[PDB]
């Protein structure tokens, strides 16, 4: 499965807090500081970026064995017909 479409309304994530607790200022400063050290990008590439799958939205379908059964079938039918035709020709030559 794959994700399509564009991005409508785009909020952000964030560590919540209480109202008027001593931490809020320092935790916001720490998040802002760490966001400018590659740390967020580092962890993103460490965890959210080992995507083995690939999209490759190209390369239309390749002919599989569903579009060649008829030709091999007519080849086999020709072989079967020739098997009897050889005897028919031999008998015709012998009679004539």
């Amino acid at each position: 499965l794959v994700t399509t479409g564009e991005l409508f309304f785009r909020s952000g994530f964030g560590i919540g807090m209480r109202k008027d607790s001593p931490w809020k200022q320092n935790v916001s400063l720490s998040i802002l500081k760490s966001h400018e050290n590659g740390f967020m990008e580092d962890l993103d590439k460490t965890w959210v970026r080992y995507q083995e799958c690939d999209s490759r939205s190209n390369a239309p379908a390749t002919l599989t064995f569903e579009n060649m059964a008829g030709v091999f079938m007519i080849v086999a039918g020709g072989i079967v017909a020739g098997i009897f035709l050889i005897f028919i020709e031999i008998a015709y030559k012998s009679r004539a």
Partner: protein, 286 residues
């Protein structure tokens, strides 16, 4: 880059299992024809004829003499014509689709970590006395000066120079770059990645410290996202003329770089021919 991804597209059609059945059917039909002819035509001089026939018959061969063999080689000719038509049709279908590639990834790359020990000397345009320069100064310093040698001119002049013969690189803010690449003549400019940046910190509105206005302004701004007017404003005054899917490349030349596997197969072929010659010479002397 106006490039088409066709490294080994010559073998793309006919999923690589029908050729084994082609060979098996070829050998079976040759053996059947020889057996029928039995009741100067050997059992090896028939695969030659049928291979040539399957492969746009051009080399002279020796036709059979029996009527049944005639009808059978005719049926094989029908097979060959159908197969060749289908193959060329699917090759034509396949070569159509080719859109673009990704020249480089983000900052994490030895390509960006090769200021001089690389191809002819490179550069990346930056705007002097900017936030980006200070950020990269705090970050990797080798790219700040050792690789940041050729500082570029202003925003428009740098893009023109990249459109000119310099065409080194450009590092700047994401929003202005996205707008500028969105609405420009032609489609010669695209931002690599476009959704994976290194220093996401956004814009904003500044207020005097501890004023007490923050709550109302913040709530008003966050309310605007609620009813989605910002998307309308952006689409009105940020969306450009470009960035509407893509159509194709259609590389006219199709140089030796894209078409090389056939010559690899031919090389394997002459290697096999020499090996067979050596084996015959060795086995014919004792």
């Amino acid at each position: 880059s106006n490039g088409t991804v066709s490294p080994s597209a010559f073998l793309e059609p006919f999923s690589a299992d029908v050729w084994v059945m082609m060979f098996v059917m070829l050998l079976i039909v040759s053996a059947v024809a020889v057996f029928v002819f039995e009741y100067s035509f050997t059992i090896g001089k028939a695969i030659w004829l049928l291979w040539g026939l399957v492969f746009n018959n051009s080399v002279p061969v020796q036709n059979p003499k029996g009527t049944t063999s005639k009808i059978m080689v005719s049926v094989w000719a029908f097979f060959a014509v159908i197969f060749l038509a289908s193959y060329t049709a699917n090759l034509a279908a396949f070569m159509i689709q080719e859109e673009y590639v990704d020249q480089v990834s983000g900052l994490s790359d030895k390509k960006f970590q090769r200021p001089n020990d690389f191809s002819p000397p490179f550069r990346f345009g930056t705007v002097p006395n900017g936030s980006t320069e200070r950020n990269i100064r705090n970050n990797y310093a080798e790219m700040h000066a050792y690789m940041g040698k050729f500082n570029q001119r202003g925003v428009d002049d740098a893009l023109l120079s990249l459109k000119t013969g310099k065409l080194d690189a450009f590092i700047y803010d994401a929003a202005v770059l996205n707008y500028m690449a969105g609405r420009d003549e032609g489609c010669k400019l695209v931002t690599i990645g476009s959704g994976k940046v290194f220093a996401s910190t956004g814009y904003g509105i500044a207020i005097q410290k501890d004023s007490g206005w923050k709550r109302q302004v913040d709530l008003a701004i966050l309310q605007l996202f609620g009813d989605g007017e910002m998307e309308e404003l952006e689409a009105l005054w940020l969306t450009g003329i470009c960035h509407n899917e893509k159509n194709e490349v259609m590389s006219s030349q199709l140089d030796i770089d894209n078409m090389a596997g056939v010559f690899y197969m031919l090389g394997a072929a002459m290697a096999l021919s020499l090996i067979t010659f050596i084996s015959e010479h060795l086995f014919y002397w004792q």
